[PDB]
Amino acid sequence: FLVTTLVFLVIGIIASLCTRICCNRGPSTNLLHLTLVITATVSCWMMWAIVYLAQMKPLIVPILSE
Amino acid sequence: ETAPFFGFLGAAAALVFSCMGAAYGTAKSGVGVASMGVMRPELVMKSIVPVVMAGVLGIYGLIIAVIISTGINPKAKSYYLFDGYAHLSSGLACGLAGLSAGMAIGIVGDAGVRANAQQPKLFVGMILILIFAEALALYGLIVGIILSSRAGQSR
Amino acid sequence: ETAPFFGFLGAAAALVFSCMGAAYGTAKSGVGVASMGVMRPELVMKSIVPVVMAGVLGIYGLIIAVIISTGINPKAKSYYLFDGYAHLSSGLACGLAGLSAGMAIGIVGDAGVRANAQQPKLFVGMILILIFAEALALYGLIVGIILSSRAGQSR
Amino acid sequence: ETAPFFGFLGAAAALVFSCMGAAYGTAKSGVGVASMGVMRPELVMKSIVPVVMAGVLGIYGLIIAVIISTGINPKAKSYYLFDGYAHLSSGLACGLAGLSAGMAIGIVGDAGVRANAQQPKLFVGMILILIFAEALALYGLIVGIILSSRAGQSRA
Amino acid sequence: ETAPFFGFLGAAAALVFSCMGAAYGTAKSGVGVASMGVMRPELVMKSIVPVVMAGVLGIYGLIIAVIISTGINPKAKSYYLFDGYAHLSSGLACGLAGLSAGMAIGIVGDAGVRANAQQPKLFVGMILILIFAEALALYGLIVGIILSSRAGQSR
Amino acid sequence: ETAPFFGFLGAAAALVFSCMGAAYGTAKSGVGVASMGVMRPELVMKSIVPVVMAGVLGIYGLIIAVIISTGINPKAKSYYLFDGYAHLSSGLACGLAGLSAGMAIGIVGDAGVRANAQQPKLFVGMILILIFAEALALYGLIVGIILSSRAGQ
Amino acid sequence: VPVVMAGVLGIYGLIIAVIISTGINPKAKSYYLFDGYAHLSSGLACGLAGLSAGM
Amino acid sequence: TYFRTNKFTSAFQEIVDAYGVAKYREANPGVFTIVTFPFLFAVMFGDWGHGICLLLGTLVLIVREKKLASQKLDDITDMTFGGRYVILMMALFSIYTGLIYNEFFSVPFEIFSHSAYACRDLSCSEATTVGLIKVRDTYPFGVDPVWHGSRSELPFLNSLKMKMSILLGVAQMNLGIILSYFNATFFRIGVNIWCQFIPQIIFLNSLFGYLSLLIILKWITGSQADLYHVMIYMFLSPTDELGDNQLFPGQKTAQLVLLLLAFVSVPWMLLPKPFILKMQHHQMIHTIEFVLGAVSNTASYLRLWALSLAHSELSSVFYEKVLLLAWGYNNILILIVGIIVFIFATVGVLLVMETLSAFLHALRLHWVEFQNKFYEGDGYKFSPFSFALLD
Amino acid sequence: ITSKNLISVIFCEAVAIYGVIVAIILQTKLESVPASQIYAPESLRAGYAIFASGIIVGFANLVCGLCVGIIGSSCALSDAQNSSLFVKILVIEIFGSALGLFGVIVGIIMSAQASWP
Amino acid sequence: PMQLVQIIIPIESAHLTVSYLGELGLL
């Protein structure tokens, strides 16, 4: 979902802006917050990508007979 | 057909092996607890945990055997080798897991009984190892649940 | 046909294994009681409790075996291997559980008798331990009852 | 048509042997840690590691068992005769690997717990030995997965 | 009909035996390394090699098992007896050789770990001895691979 | 018929037995050499006869197994239960003889290591003893080779 | 000297085995189940007695 | 040397120090691990309900830390006080992990729609049919409950989870390689960095990346019968030729070329650095270490998949017990007793046993990743003359 | 004592040569035994005779070898103890060698046993 | 980012410097 891609990118940008506003004083602290935000974005990206790759095309459907 | 010879044997074997393992573990734990109580009553009170682990293992084995027995419905289910085989496999797994857990619990109980006299922190830590062994036994029992559920394909 | 063979074999095995376990437990309890009496004849009186518990467990196993055997009536129901297999499984499970419980209870009772000779609260500790060990006999009786019911479930 | 009995037997046996090996290793490690107790109470973190390795081995065994149980679907692609034997082979391999890993892990963990009290600087080496041991269990799980893979083709 | 099933069983037994031998060798090497690290932390780093050798032997056994699994192919040929027989023989031989070599290498490493702590010079010769021990297992693995290559028994 | 199964089983048993015997002998000899080398590392460097004998046993076993495997040519010969049973038994006997010789030789070398540590005359004596044992192993290998040759008929 | 005598006893046993091999031809006499069982049992009893005597 | 650490950074510093130390100039990935270990643990396992409850308890502990500063903790409580912030971060990551898993409170819940996933068509046909179920609408925030949580959906879901864990392990290895390259830049070797880090990195990375790209291409093509074993089937033949299942038109020849390149790079990982050193004038440890590290990464992926499967199984068992208690209780008392027993058992299993096991496994995986990555131990902490009683 | 042990090893090598000769004979002593005609009772009788010959040969050879080894060990110990006592040790070694030779002669006699078609 | 440093503390002034630097200190 490209819409989900744009949403995740916007969320990352917002988080980066928040971290900058919070800790622009400490450039090293700002870099630390930026690295943390980047890592979190990468993790969420990988999770959603795996989830959607599962939904790309199903090999088989489920059976739930009583 | 030959299902009762398999299913009944598995149900009996699960309980037998689980009881044997739990009994050996409880005996080792009781010897250790007696030593600790001779050393100090507080250690005797603390040493109750291995007995609880042995009782939990025995209860799990009994529950698995009960589930296997309840699986036996010859009136509803036609005599299939697969239906008895699933119960036999579940019983064998439950019994082996119970025996292994009982032996490990006895060893851990003796160790923790020594540790309680050695140091309260040592006993507190060994409680975690006992819990881990109980969790392994529970995982075996859970696999037994899937084995029992596999019997559904037979009718 | 051959189902009475299996049923009678299981009935005999239950009693045999229960007797063996009771013998082991009684021997260990007697050794502990002799040691306690040599140490202190007065305390020896309370030391008989684990022996009584082991004997009660053995009798309960024997009683369960007798009850299972009495159910087998060839005139009551026609030849069906399911009933014989269920009876044999019940007997085997009950006997094995009783034997393991008796051996473990005897060892624990000897240790607890020594500890009680050492300290008084150790007697209560050993009583609790034996109560914990009784769970194996309880599970064996439950499994025997379940298998006896499955024997009547035959159709 | 009689293959499913062998398949269920192998599926149960895998878990049984894995649990036995894990229990042995865990008991050995716990006894060693309790011996190491009091003398070096701060070494609780080090003593936790062998229990973690035993738990990992047990989890691998449960995963192999679940995979084997999933493999048994008689509703489609009737098991024929190769399916049950393949399941039995996979289960046996998994269980044997689990037992070997459990025994080795228990022995090495007892040695490490003994070494914990004096000169704890070798904690890194002990962890490396434990990881090298658990590599065997990982290889066994991989082999079991590979064996379970060929099960489907046997239908034809 | 069921001969390739026996071949697959032998293939699995190959990895089983290889893993058992590797685990025994690794346990011996670990005990030796623990002793050496107790002696001096410096010797600990140099002592890791035998564990790596045992792991390499186990990996070789796993690779042989994977090759054997690749050997089994329904589309290759119909139910044939020789396919199971050759595969089972190769697996059994490879597994037995691996287990024996692993036990021998474990004993050798257990001796060498203690030896190196006293004198570092003999470590060079110990390395050569361990290399020869591993080379024996490698030759056994090659021999097993030869039998696996011997697949086209029919036509 | 089932002859290839019997022959493959016999060859596998031969290889496994030879490997196990070589491993046992090598383990004993290496333990002895490591024990002896503790006192004088200089003598330890000379103690390579255990490595040589272990390699010789392994090479003999591998060669015998390879020869047996080469004998399995279904295209050339349809073979018979008699021929396969003969070849398997011959190979297995060769492997067992090699294993026993290797185990005994390693047992001797275990004490020979300490003997060499004692003095060089004991070292050369143990060398001669190991040479005799290796000659026995080579005789067993030649017997196995002749037996494999007989399987051709 | 007693060791040499004991070895001579084994040599005599070998000579007896050689005589048995000379008589090993089975065309002359057909042995049934009873005959084979009798021969095997008697030989085994003699062998047990011989081993006990050697010990 | 010792790096400055905040309250949240304190637990990461403690874990890193447990994993040895590094030189003052040497890069400390402890800060990166302070998110990576939560990132892996979230991927490893997580229960939405108890995990949220555990996070709330940790937050309450952090709020009451003022009293906890006065109130001395007991044994593991002392470590918990130090690592409360890290535990809270890990639980926060596990929240999104459970959202992906969709097992809210260890139970699937509908998202947005009345049912997140349903069966299109097959109105009368059972779920065990040729048509079976069709997911006309797919859950957008998590895995489709029909495709994952259903009775027969378990095998394919587990295979997909394992395949994703393989890619996650590949990514972790790539991150370790990047950290090694960064350290080499900090090390500032004129050509030795290119001779040592570049060959040691990249080789196994692309080796596993071939399989990762194969998994991606399979997800694009959507092969059904092979499930996640199409990659195993393809890699089963390291020899050339065949390659029918190859999605990429040139996948076979390119794969052979890549295998040749990896074979050539294998000595290039070891030989150049000692050659350069001799020209100027360990590798033996580095020998086979690449294969061992790849095996370890595969082991980490398999461990993560197994932990996720075990967590799912435990959640299913708890849900089954709760359903059995609720259904078979006409009277409120039996239902209440069963619910309380199930709650206690599930709490003990998940928040204690499963949580500790997952934490230990994640710590082991992170330690393996760091050891493969960098910092090579060999260091200690900075030593000031601080008043230990006062500070 | 090393020379005495060398004499014992020579006896062992003689036993090995006897075994090799037995194997060569058995290769020659193999009856016609056609691949098709491998089911006749005469073939079974020939196989039983050959098996009996092998059992009588190998077991006796192994027993003689073990006896020679033990006697040689004791003899080497005695020779180390007393320098004079060497011929007595050689006597026991010769006795063991004679036992091995007797086993070889037994195998040679048993060589002519086969009656298979 | 540390570096080696040495400070010469007068014997009489040593006690005061030690007392001051005791809390956190640098080296």
C-alpha distance from residue D146 to each of D84, D89, D142 (Å) = 16, 11, 6
In whole angstroms, what is the distance from residue E90 CA to residue E105 CA? 22
CB contacts of C143 in chain B (<8 Å) are 11-12, 15, 62, 65-66, 69
Look up tokens 């898993």; give the residue.
H101
Q: Check the CA dihedral H138-H140-H141-H142 and report its sign.
A: positive
| Interface contact flag, B85 D9, Cβ < 8 Å | yes
C-alpha distance from residue E126 to each of F41, F51, F102, F117 (Å) = 11, 10, 20, 16
Residue D99 gets the label, from left (phi > 0), alpha (psi -120 to 50) or beta, of: alpha
3-state secondary structure of H108: strand
In whole angstroms, what is the distance from residue B130 CA to residue B140 CA? 16
- Number of alpha helices (DSSP H) and beta strands (DSSP E) in chain F: 5, 0
Give ∠ CA D27-D28-D30 in degrees, rounded to 5: 65
In whole angstroms, what is the distance from residue H37 CA to residue H33 CA? 5
| Interface contact flag, H24 J1, Cβ < 8 Å | yes
In whole angstroms, what is the distance from residue F66 CA to residue F12 CA? 10
Of residues E89, E103, E107, the one with CA closest to residue E13:
E89
Residue F130 structure tokens: 């190991």
Give ∠ CA H240-H246-H247 in degrees, rounded to 5: 155
Structure solved via: cryo-EM
C117 touches B at CB < 8 Å: no
The CA distance from F36 to the nearest CA of chain E, in Å, is 10
Residue H146 structure tokens: 């029909």
Contact status, residue H15 vs residue H90, Cβ threshold 8 Å: no
Give ∠ CA H147-B144-H348 in degrees, rounded to 5: 80
Give chain C's length: 155
Contact status, residue F22 vs residue F61, Cβ threshold 8 Å: yes
E122 touches H at CB < 8 Å: no
Residue type (1 letter), H99: L
**How far apart are the two ends of chain D, measured CA to CA in Å?**
15
Of residues C14, C7, C49, the one with CA closest to residue C141:
C14
Q: How many CB atoms lie within 10 A of CB B149?
A: 16
C-alpha distance from residue D76 to each of D3, D5, D80, E5, H235 (Å) = 15, 17, 11, 21, 27
In whole angstroms, what is the distance from residue D46 CA to residue D48 CA? 5
In whole angstroms, what is the distance from residue I102 CA to residue D129 CA? 58
Q: How many CB atoms lie within 10 A of CB C72?
A: 18
In whole angstroms, what is the distance from residue F33 CA to residue F114 CA? 7
H or E segment and range at residue G14: helix G2-22
Give ∠ CA E49-E52-E55 in degrees, rounded to 5: 155
The CA distance from A14 to the nearest CA of chain H, in Å, is 18
Are E and D touching by the rule of 3+ CB pairs within 8 Å?
yes
Find the CB nearest E52 among H236, H237, H288: H288
3-state secondary structure of D118: coil
Residue F46 structure tokens: 């000379």
Give ∠ CA B140-B143-B147 in degrees, rounded to 5: 135
Residue A17 structure tokens: 């802006």
Q: Helix-strand-coil percent breakdown of chain C, rounded to 5?
A: 90, 0, 10
Contact status, residue B94 vs residue D15, Cβ threshold 8 Å: no
Contact status, residue H300 vs residue H371, Cβ threshold 8 Å: no
| Interface contact flag, I106 G7, Cβ < 8 Å | no
Q: What is the resolution of this structure in A?
A: 4.3
In whole angstroms, what is the distance from residue B1 CA to residue B9 CA? 14
Alpha helices by DSSP H, listed for chain B, are: 3-39, 41-46, 48-71, 81-118, 120-149
| Interface contact flag, E44 D122, Cβ < 8 Å | yes
In whole angstroms, what is the distance from residue D51 CA to residue D57 CA? 10
For chain H, the maximum distance between any two Cα atoms, rounded to a whole number of angstroms, is 87
| Interface contact flag, E115 F38, Cβ < 8 Å | yes
Alpha helices by DSSP H, listed for chain I, are: 2-29, 41-81, 87-110
Residues C86/C88/C89/C92 CA torsion (nearest 10 deg): 160
In whole angstroms, what is the distance from residue B66 CA to residue B87 CA? 11
8-state DSSP, D121:
G
In whole angstroms, what is the distance from residue H124 CA to residue H303 CA? 41
Neighbour-count burial for D136-154, b at 16+ CB within 10 Å, e otherwise: bbbbbbbbbbbbbbbbbbb
Contact status, residue H177 vs residue H205, Cβ threshold 8 Å: yes
Contact status, residue C61 vs residue C94, Cβ threshold 8 Å: yes
Of residues B86, B11, B81, the one with CA closest to residue C151:
B11
Of residues I60, I54, I61, the one with CA closest to residue I12:
I61
H or E segment and range at residue E58: helix E49-71
Contact status, residue H346 vs residue H106, Cβ threshold 8 Å: yes
3-state secondary structure of I40: coil
Give ∠ CA E119-E120-E126 in degrees, rounded to 5: 100
Of residues F49, H270, F38, the one with CA closest to residue E132:
F49
CB contacts of H356 in chain B (<8 Å) are 128
In whole angstroms, what is the distance from residue D109 CA to residue B132 CA? 15
Phi, psi for E129 (deg, rounded to 5)? -60, -45
Neighbour-count burial for H344-380, b at 16+ CB within 10 Å, e otherwise: eebbebbbebbbbbbbbbbbbbbbbbbbbbbbeeebe
In whole angstroms, what is the distance from residue H340 CA to residue H332 CA? 12
B122 touches D at CB < 8 Å: yes
In whole angstroms, what is the distance from residue D14 CA to residue D99 CA? 10
Give me the residues paired with residue H103 across strands: H108
